[PDB]
């Protein structure tokens, strides 16, 4: 009941995202996720 | 075996230069193709120098 006596209340930080621009990583990321490899992996 | 003794000061004539200009190119350019063409090149250039300097130091 006692934390209405505060003077540095704020409410949240409802700030909007920062923006980001697109780098050249993620395509690499994709590239090497495509092929192949020596191992097997699974087997049913 | 005699001209193959030096030019192994030819090579690393070029070496860093060659990376120098790597490095310019892969700054300045503004493509992802070229991008990571640059980068994987920059990656082979320090592998193959590092194992052509300790091949060196290893035979004399």
Same mark, same amino acid.
């Given at each position: 009941?006692?934390?209405?006596?505060?003077? !540095?209340?704020?409410?949240?930080? #409802?700030? &909007?995202?920062?923006?980001? #621009? *697109?780098? #050249?990583?993620?395509?690499?990321?994709?590239?090497?996720?495509? &092929?192949?490899? !020596?191992?097997?992996?699974?087997? *049913? | @075996?005699?001209?193959?003794?030096?030019?192994?000061?030819?090579?690393?004539? %070029? =070496?860093?230069?060659?990376?120098?200009?790597?490095?310019?190119?892969?700054?300045?350019? %503004? @493509?992802?193709? %070229?991008? =990571?063409?640059?980068?994987?090149?920059?990656?082979?250039?320090?592998?193959? %120098?590092?194992? =052509?300097?300790?091949?060196?130091?290893?035979?004399?």
């Amino acid at each position: 009941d006692n934390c209405r006596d505060v003077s !540095d209340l704020k409410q949240y930080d #409802s700030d &909007e995202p920062e923006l980001r #621009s *697109l780098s #050249s990583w993620i395509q690499n990321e994709f590239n090497k996720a495509c &092929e192949l490899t !020596d191992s097997t992996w699974i087997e *049913l | @075996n005699g001209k193959w003794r030096e030019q192994l000061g030819q090579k690393f004539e %070029e =070496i860093r230069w060659l990376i120098e200009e790597v490095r310019h190119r892969l700054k300045t350019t %503004e @493509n992802s193709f %070229e991008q =990571i063409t640059f980068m994987q090149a920059l990656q082979l250039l320090f592998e193959v %120098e590092q194992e =052509i300097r300790t091949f060196s130091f290893q035979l004399i």
